[PDB]
Amino acid sequence: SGFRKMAFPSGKVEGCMVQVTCGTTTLNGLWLDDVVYCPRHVICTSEDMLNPNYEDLLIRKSNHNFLVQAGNVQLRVIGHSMQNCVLKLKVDTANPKTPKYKFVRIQPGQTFSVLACYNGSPSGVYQCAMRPNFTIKGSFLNGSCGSVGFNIDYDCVSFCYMHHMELPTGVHAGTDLEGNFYGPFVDRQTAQAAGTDTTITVNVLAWLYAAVINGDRWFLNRFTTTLNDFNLVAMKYNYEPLTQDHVDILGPLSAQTGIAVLDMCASLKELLQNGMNGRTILGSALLEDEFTPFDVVRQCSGVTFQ
Amino acid sequence: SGFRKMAFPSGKVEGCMVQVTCGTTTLNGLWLDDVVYCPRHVICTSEDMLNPNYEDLLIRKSNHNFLVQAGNVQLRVIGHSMQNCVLKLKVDTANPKTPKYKFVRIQPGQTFSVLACYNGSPSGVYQCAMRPNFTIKGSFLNGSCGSVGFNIDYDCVSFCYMHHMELPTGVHAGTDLEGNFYGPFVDRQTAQAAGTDTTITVNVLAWLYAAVINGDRWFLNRFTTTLNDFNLVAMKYNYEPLTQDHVDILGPLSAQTGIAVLDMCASLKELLQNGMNGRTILGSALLEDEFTPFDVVRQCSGVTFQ
Numbered sequence: 273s274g275f276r277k278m279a280f281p282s283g284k285v286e287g288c289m290v291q292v293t294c295g296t297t298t299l300n301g302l303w304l305d306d307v308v309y310c311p312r313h314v315i316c317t318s319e320d321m322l323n324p325n326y327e328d329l330l331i332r333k334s335n336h337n338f339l340v341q342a343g344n345v346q347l348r349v350i351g352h353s354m355q356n357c358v359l360k361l362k363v364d365t366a367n368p369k370t371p372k373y374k375f376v377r378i379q380p381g382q383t384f385s386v387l388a389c390y391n392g393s394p395s396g397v398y399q400c401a402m403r404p405n406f407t408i409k410g411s412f413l414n415g416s417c418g419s420v421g422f423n424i425d426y427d428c429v430s431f432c433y434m435h436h437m438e439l440p441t442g443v444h445a446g447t448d449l450e451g452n453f454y455g456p457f458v459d460r461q462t463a464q465a466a467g468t469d470t471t472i473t474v475n476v477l478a479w480l481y482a483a484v485i486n487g488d489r490w491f492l493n494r495f496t497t498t499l500n501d502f503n504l505v506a507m508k509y510n511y512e513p514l515t516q517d518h519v520d521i522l523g524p525l526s527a528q529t530g531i532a533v534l535d536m537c538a539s540l541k542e543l544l545q546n547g548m549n550g551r552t553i554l555g556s557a558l559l560e561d562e563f564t565p566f567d568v569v570r571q572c573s574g575v576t577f578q
Numbered sequence: 579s580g581f582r583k584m585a586f587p588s589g590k591v592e593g594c595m596v597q598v599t600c601g602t603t604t605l606n607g608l609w610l611d612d613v614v615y616c617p618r619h620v621i622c623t624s625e626d627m628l629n630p631n632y633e634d635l636l637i638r639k640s641n642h643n644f645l646v647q648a649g650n651v652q653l654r655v656i657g658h659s660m661q662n663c664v665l666k667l668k669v670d671t672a673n674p675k676t677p678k679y680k681f682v683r684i685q686p687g688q689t690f691s692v693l694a695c696y697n698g699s700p701s702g703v704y705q706c707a708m709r710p711n712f713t714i715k716g717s718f719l720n721g722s723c724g725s726v727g728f729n730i731d732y733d734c735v736s737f738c739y740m741h742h743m744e745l746p747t748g749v750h751a752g753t754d755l756e757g758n759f760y761g762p763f764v765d766r767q768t769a770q771a772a773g774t775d776t777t778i779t780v781n782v783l784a785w786l787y788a789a790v791i792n793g794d795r796w797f798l799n800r801f802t803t804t805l806n807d808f809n810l811v812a813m814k815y816n817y818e819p820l821t822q823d824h825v826d827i828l829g830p831l832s833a834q835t836g837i838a839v840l841d842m843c844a845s846l847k848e849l850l851q852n853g854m855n856g857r858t859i860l861g862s863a864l865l866e867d868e869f870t871p872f873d874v875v876r877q878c879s880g881v882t883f884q
């Protein structure tokens with residue numbers, strides 16, 4: 273029993289974190305085989321950040337301008353290239369701790385574990401969702417940039433996020449590991465605004481199923497809804513539209529609990545219209561949207577507590 | 579910016595998790611140097627669990643009855659002993675991945691990271707507090723027993739919890755790594771009840787300071803309280819009494835924010851008496867009590883956002 277925001281075990285990623293320094297700028301990098309990946313704005317000085325021309329900045333650099341430190345050993349940079357907003361530093365030593373890995377670009381609504389790092393040393397691990405507006409609500413301080421987000425599947429690490437900046441509103445923006453930003457953002461020190469965010473409906477439904485699996489049913493009701501009528505309520509409360517694909521993805525949880533997806537939608541509709549009236553679900557007084565259906569299946573029992 | 583429940587990086591503990599099997603009972607063990615630590619009820623059959631005499635059960639066992647598996651290698655048990663409710667299996671191989679470590683018995687109100695494991699394989703990491711009634715609100719399924727809780731300080735792992743059982747109410751009970759239960763519990767399969775729980779007042783205050791550091795002040799007020807008058811309100815709302823020791827521990831956070839501890843107590847009093855009126859603090863609609871003052875200092879900026 274129980275239900276917690278649960279990160280993946282971080283050891284396979286810990287062994288890949290390094291420190292990258294150029295001039296007086298230091299941030300984190302990801303060392304896989306003989307390549308170190310890091311945000312390209314490491315090459316900027318504080319004045320370069322306002323409006324940098326990165327190609328003009330990088331051509332003025334040499335391999336030996338980059339200082340890469342893995343624990344207490346320096347790695348010699350023997351080549352460098354830029355791929356979108358990530359810098360790739362070829363080093364003379366392959367990381368002996370390289371896990372099986374993939375780079376993946378995730379969809380909004382998906383979750384991942386963040387290994388927050390400072391000066392190449394891991395400090396903590398927590399779970400994040402990619403918001404519909406392509407920000408994440410992380411916990412990051414100066415020096416965190418280059419920290420990565422990941423999922424793990426049978427000892428393969430799928431890296432999906434590299435941290436690049438905190439926006440003026442205090443939420444966070446970054447790239448896939450091939451250097452493409454999530455969302456409309458660019459890597460320059462300008463005040464950039466995210467689009468208006470929405471609540472991840474399929475995730476709230478997954479979390480309601482988690483609550484039922486764990487033995488709680490107080491929010492259920494005898495009603496059902498059509499998909500169309502549910503989405504009319506969803507729009508009113510700034511929830512993302514629920515698609516038939518979402519309904520299909522919730523199939524297994526519906527089958528395990530015996531609660532049809534559109535019946536759980538009717539529960540959610542009632543919760544949105546009436547509130548919780550002082551009650552909690554899985555210890556929360558708000559409707560939680562940062563658990564995917566996969567996250568629920570991963571953590572909850574495979575048999576519902578009746 | 580941001581504030582999340584943040585676990586310690588788990589790699590140093592991952593390399594210590596093994597599987598222990600006796601008869602048809604399999605659970606997790608902790609492999610440090612040439613000793614494997616695990617819950618002693620691994621030696622019980624399903625019938626032994628009702629009321630076991632562990633000394634009588636253990637004297638009937640031989641070293642070779644214990645099967646210890648570390649990944650895909652078997653460790654030979656060359657001795658065994660019982661220390662309170664933990665079994666210590668001496669094996670013929672020292673763990674090459676043993677971190678610097680200590681065993682510590684924590685006080686209620688302290689937090690730790692849990693590495694949830696099944697069949698000796700880590701599955702997830704999350705943060706827990708030891709409740710005032712000496713349970714934890716974990717997330718655990720069958721096979722999790724022997725999973726450990728820990729804190730890390732400058733590459734030293736302080737192990738403080740080993741998981742032994744889920745109570746009828748779905749909360750969790752366990753021991754320190756020397757086998758002494760937290761709370762009044764015993765390791766037998768009987769319905770055991772925890773004492774009535776309370777809210778960890780010093781932790782709620784720490785979390786209010788975290789909110790101020792992150793830039794939010796809406797809950798502050800112009801009032802102050804005496805310690806005695808605050809604790810009269812604390813008792814009404816099932817909060818633990820606040821001691822002068824707690825006030826001292828909050829000293830650094832008070833100094834960083836410029837908010838006296840007894841002034842923050844007056845904010846908390848108003849929040850308890852009036853509720854939040856539809857507002858949130860650090861994204862929560864409830865008052866959070868599973869962040870210690872240390873947890874806040876560890877994660878938040880050292881300079882308040884004014």
Ligand SMILES: N#Cc1ccccc1C[C@@H](N)C(=O)N[C@H](Cc1ccc(Cl)cc1Cl)C(=O)N[C@H](CC(=O)NCCCNc1nnc(N)[nH]1)Cc1ccc(F)cc1
Nearest residue numbers: 412413414417437438439440441442459460461462463793
């Ligand atoms: N993670 C992180 C982090 C956090 C703090 C400091 C440093 C870092 C890592 C570091 N690498 C980082 O992100 N630096 C960026 C600057 C940067 C470097 C490089 C590139 Cl390519 C792009 C960028 Cl934008 C940075 O300084 N951003 C600040 C963070 C801030 O001041 N936050 C407090 C207010 C939160 N909002 C709030 N609080 N309360 C209310 N009600 N609202 C916001 C900003 C301000 C002007 C601006 F024009 C753009 C952005």
Ligand SMILES: N#Cc1ccccc1C[C@@H](N)C(=O)N[C@H](Cc1ccc(Cl)cc1Cl)C(=O)N[C@H](CC(=O)NCCCNc1nnc(N)[nH]1)Cc1ccc(F)cc1
Nearest residue numbers: 487718719720723743744745746747748765766767768769
């Ligand atoms: N972690 C964990 C875990 C979770 C499930 C299964 C297995 C494990 C690990 C495994 N090692 C474990 O803990 N087994 C224990 C049995 C045990 C083994 C050895 C020793 Cl020394 C001591 C003990 Cl007690 C066990 O089966 N406990 C069940 C768990 C249960 O059935 N939970 C569903 C209800 C939650 N409550 C609720 N849900 N909804 C509402 N409103 N209330 C509770 C119980 C039931 C009778 C009883 F007499 C004592 C305790």
